[PDB]
């Protein structure tokens, strides 16, 4: 109401659109809107952190990209776009009745996609990916090669031992690989694929500082806590402080136990992963506890999956843009087997059945999902585990080439094959 009245003074050439917060109409303009012309208040910036990369079960965004609220949104018809625009924002910044006019357009393109750049009072700056990139963005020296040693890796909430597989693919010599896990299927996977070399512990809630000390020094501590109780798109979520969210704190403890003391300058590195859909207070508390700001890395650059994840850690050069390698499969069609056709160009895991086979809507294959996530083929085919269990295992797992990108400079710090 008040915001709508203000926008009146904006179009009467009495107020600059760049001087008003186009999300909620607050006067406390501090930052500029990264996607379009206008200002942004701090409160809306926090809302913008949570809501932009939230997707519903249909594979489209949960909320409007502009105001990061809205009660009824317009979905986008154009290929590979997942954005939504709430009716209210469209009926202000573009013009009155433009929203219902977009409702009636059966082949409709949203304003983020359409070829033209000017749309009424709404203007889109062309540098929005780079500004968005920067918006979401004790140093050890290099060790000389002869002094390099095999890496020792602790992987908490190890899952299917993706980290050891990545280090093997990079040809780094692994002295030992200790892994905490509770799911029998996931325990089996590591044993088989890595030939018994993986020391399986059990419940991470049994792991003491004494255990960590007597297991010998660790060179790399890695992990991803369960995201079911952190991800905001779960209505029944218990947050960071209840249910399975609190396993992150156990990770924080064992990382603290595994970190060298001050004055001991031996090389040590860590990587923690979580979903982008994590709450403002949850994300803030995690970011404060790990004493760093997260780097946001999207799988779509190197892994042909729309999987935007936060990575806390101290791996060197982890800000540098992702450079694809020829080995990597940037296309979903370059991962499916012959006779199957990809609906979309990227799979969505944070149409429901993204396969066209024999003019029929088929579901995603487990092995094709393996190839998408960058795992060497038939990695999770070890025991007599259900399709549901293998799907859940691949879903919770890391994107392999993203982990290869992050782990890549560790080759300059430990012994290589």
Which residue positions form the known binding site for S-adenosyl-L-methionine? 158-162, 181, 203-205, 396-398
| Sole binder of ligand SAH in the list 23, 61, 62, 186 (CB under 6 A) | 186
Q: Which is nearer to a second copy, 162 or 380 (CB)?
A: 380
Sheet containing 340-342: order of strands: 340-342, 355-357, 361-362
| Interface segment toward ligand SAH; rule CB under 6 A; list 47-55, 177-185, 279-287, 312-320 | 177-185
Decide if 396 contacts 296 (C-beta within 8 A): no
Q: Does 377 bind a second copy (CB under 8 A)?
A: yes
Q: Which is nearer to Zn ion, 135 or 200 (CB)?
A: 135
| Sole binder of a second copy in the list 75, 183, 192, 341 (CB under 8 A) | 192
C-alpha span between 296 and 274 (Å, rounded): 10
Question: Element (H or E) spanning 243, and its range?
Answer: none
| Sole binder of ligand SAH in the list 159, 279, 294, 354 (CB under 6 A) | 159
* Alpha carbon distances (Å) from 300 to 80, 209, 349, 351: 11, 38, 12, 18
C-alpha span between 161 and 179 (Å, rounded): 8
Residue tagged 């795992």 (tokens): 375
Handedness of CA 338, 344, 347, 349 (dihedral sign): negative
Q: Does 352 bind a second copy (CB under 8 A)?
A: no
Q: What share of the chain is helix, strand, coil (3-state, %, to 5)?
A: 30, 15, 50
Name the active-site residue from 227, 335, 366, 416.
227
Q: Which is nearer to a second copy, 12 or 384 (CB)?
A: 384
- The entry of a second copy, Zn ion, ligand SAH, none near residue 396 (CB within 5 to 8 angstroms by kind) is ligand SAH
> For ligand SAH, which residue has the nearest CB?
159
- Of the candidates 273, 272, 271, 270, the residue with the CA atom closest to the CA atom of residue 258: 270
CB-based contacts of 194: which residues, under 8 Å, 6+ apart?
161, 164, 165, 168, 177
Torsion, Cα of 235, 69, 64, 273 (10° steps): -50
| Interface segment toward a second copy; rule CB under 8 A; list 234-242, 293-301, 321-329, 378-386 | 378-386
- The entry of Zn ion, a second copy, ligand SAH, none near residue 378 (CB within 5 to 8 angstroms by kind) is a second copy
Q: Which is nearer to ligand SAH, 85 or 218 (CB)?
A: 218
335 is catalytic: no
| Sole binder of ligand SAH in the list 27, 137, 182, 199 (CB under 6 A) | 182
| Sole binder of a second copy in the list 41, 161, 165, 385 (CB under 8 A) | 385
Question: Element (H or E) spanning 311, and its range?
Answer: strand 308-313
Catalytic residue numbers read 227
The residues that touch Zn ion, with contacts defined as CB under 5 A, are 21, 23-24, 26, 41, 44, 64, 66-67, 70, 76, 78, 81, 86, 89, 110, 112-113
């Amino acid at each position: 109401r008040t915001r709508e009245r203000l926008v009146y003074e904006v179009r009467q050439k009495c107020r600059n659109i760049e001087d008003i917060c186009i999300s909620c109409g607050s006067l406390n303009v501090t930052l500029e809107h990264p996607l379009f012309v206008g200002g942004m208040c701090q409160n809306c910036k926090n809302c913008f952190l949570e809501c932009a990369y939230q997707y519903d079960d249909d594979g489209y965004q949960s909320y409007c990209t502009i105001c990061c609220g809205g009660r009824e949104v317009l979905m986008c018809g154009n290929n590979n776009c997942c954005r939504c625009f709430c009716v209210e924002c469209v009926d202000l910044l573009v013009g009155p009745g433009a929203a219902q006019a977009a409702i009636k357009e059966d082949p409709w393109n949203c304003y983020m996609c359409g070829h033209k750049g000017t749309y009424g009072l709404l203007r889109r700056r062309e540098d929005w990916p780079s500004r968005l990139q920067m918006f979401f963005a004790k140093v050890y020296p290099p060790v000389p090669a002869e002094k390099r040693k095999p890496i020792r890796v602790l992987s908490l909430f190890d899952g299917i031992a993706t980290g050891l597989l990545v280090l093997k693919d990079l040809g780094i010599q692994v002295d030992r690989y200790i892994a905490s896990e509770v799911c029998e299927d996931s325990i089996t996977v590591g044993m088989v694929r890595h030939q018994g070399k993986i020391m399986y512990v059990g419940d991470v809630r049994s792991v003491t500082q004494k255990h960590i000390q007597e297991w010998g020094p660790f060179d790399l501590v890695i992990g991803g806590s369960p995201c079911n109780d952190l991800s905001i798109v779960n209505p029944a979520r218990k947050g960071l402080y209840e249910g399975t969210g609190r396993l992150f704190f156990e990770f924080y403890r064992l990382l603290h136990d595994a970190r060298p003391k001050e004055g001991d300058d031996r090389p040590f590195f860590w990587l923690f992963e979580n979903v982008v859909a994590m709450g403002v207070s949850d994300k803030r508390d995690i970011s404060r506890f790990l004493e760093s700001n997260p780097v946001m890395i999207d799988a779509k650059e190197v892994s042909a999956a729309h999987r935007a994840r936060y990575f806390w850690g101290n791996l060197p050069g982890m800000n540098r843009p992702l450079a694809s390698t020829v080995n990597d499969k940037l296309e979903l069609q370059e991962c499916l087997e012959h006779g199957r056709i990809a609906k979309f160009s990227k799979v969505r895991t944070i149409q429901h059945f993204p396969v066209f086979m024999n003019e029929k809507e088929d579901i995603l294959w487990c092995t094709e999902m393996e190839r998408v996530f960058g795992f060497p083929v038939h990695y999770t085919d070890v025991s007599n585990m259900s399709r549901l269990a293998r799907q859940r295992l691949l879903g919770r797992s890391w994107s392999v080439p993203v982990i290869r990108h992050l782990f890549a400079p560790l080759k300059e710090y430990f012994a290589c094959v």
